[PDB]
Design a protein around this ligand. Sequence first.
Ligand code: CL
Ligand code: CL
Ligand code: CL
Ligand code: CL
Ligand code: K
Lengths: 153, 421
Amino acid sequence: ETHINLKVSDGSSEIFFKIKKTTPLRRLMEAFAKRQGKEMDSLTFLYDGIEIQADQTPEDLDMEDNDIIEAHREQIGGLPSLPFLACISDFPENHGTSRRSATVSLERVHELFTEHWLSNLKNRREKRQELAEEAVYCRSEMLSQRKLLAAVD
Amino acid sequence: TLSDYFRFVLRVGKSLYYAGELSFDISKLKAETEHQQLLRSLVSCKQVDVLRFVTSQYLEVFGTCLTKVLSGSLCIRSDVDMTHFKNILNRGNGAGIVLGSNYTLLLFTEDNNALMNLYDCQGQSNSPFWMVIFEPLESILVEWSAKNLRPKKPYHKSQSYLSYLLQLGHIDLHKIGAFQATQILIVSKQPSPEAEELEDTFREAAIPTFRGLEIPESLFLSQNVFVFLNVSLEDDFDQLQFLTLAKRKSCKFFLFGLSLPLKTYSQYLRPMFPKGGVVSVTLSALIKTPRLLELISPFLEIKKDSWILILPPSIVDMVKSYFVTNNPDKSLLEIQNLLNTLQRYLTNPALKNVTLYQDWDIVIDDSADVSLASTLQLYQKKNYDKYRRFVLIHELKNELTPVNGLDIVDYDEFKETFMRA
Ligand SMILES: [Cl-]
Ligand SMILES: [Cl-]
Ligand SMILES: [Cl-]
Ligand SMILES: [Cl-]
Ligand SMILES: [K+]
């Protein structure tokens, strides 16, 4: 009737909200951002493919009980391309690539990326709290890449 | 510019042997407007060296980072050794790849069921070969891809990859013997991305791990206990209720987490309360027990290497002041004699481990006892890297509010516990 339950998710973590349909989503967005040490502008919330501004209300978007809002972090360097960079090898004239040779490569690529990310911290204007959550995000992603590479059948 | 074809010589491998001269229809790219920078490069290109390779399976799974621009069948104007080039692609079950500055090329045969579907290769079959053009990758990335042979710091099969990543991130838990712990204790403010990532690391090693502000007393009793404080508690760690008990129970302490100062151990991993300790006395104590300094002197001798006694530089003038205040009509000849004893224990460097607080170290308070107790507290915050214990001898034990990490004991307590050794 007066309130609705919403689910904000970034694919890995979900949070539920109880808010009036007549109140601006600014509070909901800035709340979610806080739990990730992020600024509200550092993320992008979108409901049904469309983005949401800080003044639009659940009444505007005509949101319904138990609906979802997808939060999307801004891509981090070339993080998503790392495992692909490791798979590349010399043209097989005589030898053939090994699945172990790929994981060992991924180790080197994960190393290069890290050393570069850390070295890049001077150029970062973000706060400590926000860069910390990111470093942890990077490592969990890199870990996921490793598990996926070793899963190749 | 009137040409509709991208024509080039194809060389392969470390021998750079000539496979042949090929053509690729780019007329579908001339109508577009977004890839002019790309097309100009394609045209001026007259030679393509295929030196790298990637399997089909890896492309299907990790190839989405590529941005497809155009795909089609290659045309052979001249065939020097294309047969061999085909055989190798088929045996390798993959595609030759070129990571250029202005574009990315994939070359594979029509026998490659995987890639024929992965890139919707349809239309005119000009030859057994097919090519796909993607947008170039960031310079930095291509560079890593070339240095992707071997890591500088090798991953060990016995360690969890989760810890190895932390290791690369300059948090080397193995260097501090963390993985021989009998209990892990993790503490942090919220939100706590690092703290709970750390919990994961140790839960993987099957080491008993607990996280939170409220830690049960029983968890400190293990043989080899590790206490990890997140950087977010670097200035409030003396609010942890369990701090002193932990020190008593021979726990090892570490600061961990990303820190930005300019904006064995590792950079984002730091020891706390390593060894030794600091001892100070309150005025209320110096009066209840005048002999204190010369009476705990022997303890300082033994611990001359890991311990120090620390008094404020104004300690003589401090006693005197509070001696007059307390006893306004007490004789003066007695005053000088009591003061000479302190001045003597400071003036004459009898002990090398008898230091004086720096003038800017003293925390001010109307009560001298509160002042000295607060100065030691501030000393723990600024010297947790040099000393483990911080003991304050004071007349009445429950007269001062406890400070986490400190031992506020009267002489008798100090006598039975610390001096018994
Ligand atoms: Cl990312
Ligand atoms: Cl990292
Ligand atoms: Cl915690
Ligand atoms: Cl870090
Ligand atoms: K213990």
